[PDB]
Amino acid sequence: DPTVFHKRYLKKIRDLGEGHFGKVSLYCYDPTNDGTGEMVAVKALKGWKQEIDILRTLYHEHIIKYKGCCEDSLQLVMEYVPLGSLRDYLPRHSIGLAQLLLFAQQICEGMAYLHSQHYIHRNLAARNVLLDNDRLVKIGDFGLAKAVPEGHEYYRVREDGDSPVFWYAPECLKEYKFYYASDVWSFGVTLYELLTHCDSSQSPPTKFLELIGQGQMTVLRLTELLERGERLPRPDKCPCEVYHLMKNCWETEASFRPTFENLIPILKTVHEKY
Numbered sequence: 001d002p003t004v005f006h007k008r009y010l011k012k013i014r015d016l017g018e019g020h021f022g023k024v025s026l027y028c029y030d031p032t033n034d035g036t037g038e039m040v041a042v043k044a045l046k047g048w049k050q051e052i053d054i055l056r057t058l059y060h061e062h063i064i065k066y067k068g069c070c071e072d073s074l075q076l077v078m079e080y081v082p083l084g085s086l087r088d089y090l091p092r093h094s095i096g097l098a099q100l101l102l103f104a105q106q107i108c109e110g111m112a113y114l115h116s117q118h119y120i121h122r123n124l125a126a127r128n129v130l131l132d133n134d135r136l137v138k139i140g141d142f143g144l145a146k147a148v149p150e151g152h153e154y155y156r157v158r159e160d161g162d163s164p165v166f167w168y169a170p171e172c173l174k175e176y177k178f179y180y181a182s183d184v185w186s187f188g189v190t191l192y193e194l195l196t197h198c199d200s201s202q203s204p205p206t207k208f209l210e211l212i213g214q215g216q217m218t219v220l221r222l223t224e225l226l227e228r229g230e231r232l233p234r235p236d237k238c239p240c241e242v243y244h245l246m247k248n249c250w251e252t253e254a255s256f257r258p259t260f261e262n263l264i265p266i267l268k269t270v271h272e273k274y
């Protein structure tokens, strides 16, 4: 059985990031001592194992590949995505706009599948969308991902620690209810990030805080500003056609947002424009 990795052949290289509930690091796995073995990403895990059992059930060219784990409180071993998050990639190479859209499209394709499998990612951001060799997109960090019980469209989570609250839809901040349609929202927020090339002095949190005037009175107020109808600016050089698409993902009422199913053909249509 290949999905069992032996702690005795994982020599580490460097840390990679902080994931949700786990630190992540690059490892070289050589169980045959042939002198090269294989390259993998390992997430040191702290119901805290849920990332594992979800990712294990998913097979898709835009979701990060589950390779197996590691035991002695345990450790997720994933396919290695060489180029890291777009959050770091974008602000450091200039990219075409058509290219920015083709990435958006790909995240929809993965997300559509995720949802078709009855999961919510709960964490979709430029941070957590990784690039491989051919510039193919892979959705990562399933730290917050959740099973949606069959029969229902949402799922209630009372947060313990940090939440990407600036990527979340009202229903989530307001009521702690996450629908499939909440991932669509976040996808909208991501799409903005893409088109701001993740410039940090353009990021969602810096923008939303300007709109107000920090503190723990923020989430109440941010709910109130999203609820009054205010949104992120139209990124510079971002076309109307696109900014509308985002705005649609940002419908206040979840039942009004488009689905990932629908987003796919619409994005192919628009990527084709340029």
Ligand SMILES: Cc1ccccc1-n1cc(-c2ccn(C)n2)c2[nH]nc(N)c2c1=O
Binding pocket: 016, 017, 018, 019, 020, 024, 041, 064, 078, 079, 080, 081, 082, 083, 084, 085, 127, 128, 129, 130, 140, 141
């Ligand atoms: C998505 C995420 C969230 C949180 C923490 C780590 C990652 N993360 C980061 C990378 C990475 C960082 C730098 N580089 C060059 N690559 C990576 N590569 N391959 C993977 N599976 C993965 C990965 O999960």
